[PDB]
DNA sequence: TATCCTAACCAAAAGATGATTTGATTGAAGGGCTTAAAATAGGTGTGACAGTAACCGCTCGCTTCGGCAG
């Protein structure tokens, strides 16, 4: 069960380029997405679809507190709560204006 | 420079503008009436009739069962 049997990618390979030596339909669709975004009018490193989630994940994921009293108990429940804003679009119903709080 | 404004333009939220599709309304017609009359021909149930029926504060008079009489 060693990883040499599974690691088609070497540890020194960047994720910014699609490996052409693949048979994946997913990577084919990814190539279709990337090819039409390489022109001077379309090439950029802007937001993909959203930014907030990773920014507030990496800012806190895997970190530990500076005080002992602020320690999460082992096995403590983590609850994800979405709080909607008072200013609703009142034009769309699929998506909502909300902020997600972890308690 | 690190960073920004926001003229003119690109990506996305929202904010809006007219053409088209679907939920909803209805105009007209199938239909099935009305009393008004005049008429012969009719069937019986039923609803009066009638009957029994039943159910639903003070002061006198009168009486008895023993304690001596005979």
Swiss-Prot record:
GO biological process: snRNA transcription; snRNA transcription by RNA polymerase II; snRNA transcription by RNA polymerase III; transcription by RNA polymerase II; transcription by RNA polymerase III
MF terms (GO), sorted A to Z: bent DNA binding; DNA binding; RNA polymerase III general transcription initiation factor activity; RNA polymerase III type 3 promoter sequence-specific DNA binding
Tree of life domain: Eukaryota
Record's keyword annotation contains Glycoprotein: no
Chief location: nucleus
Disulfide bonds: none
Subunit description: Part of the SNAPc complex composed of 5 subunits: SNAPC1, SNAPC2, SNAPC3, SNAPC4 and SNAPC5. SNAPC3 interacts with SNAPC1.
The protein's name: snRNA-activating protein complex subunit 3
Organism: Homo sapiens
């Amino acid at each position: 069960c060693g990883l040499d049997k599974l690691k088609c990618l070497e540890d020194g390979e960047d994720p910014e380029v699609i490996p052409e030596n693949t048979d994946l339909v997913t990577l084919g669709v990814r190539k279709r997405f990337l090819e039409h975004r390489e022109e001077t009018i379309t090439i950029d490193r802007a937001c993909r679809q959203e930014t907030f989630v990773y920014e507030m994940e990496s800012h806190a994921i895997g970190k530990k507190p500076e005080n002992s009293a602020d320690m999460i108990e082992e096995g403590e429940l983590i609850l994800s709560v979405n709080i909607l804003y008072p200013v609703i679009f009142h034009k769309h119903k699929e998506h909502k204006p909300y902020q997600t709080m972890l308690v």
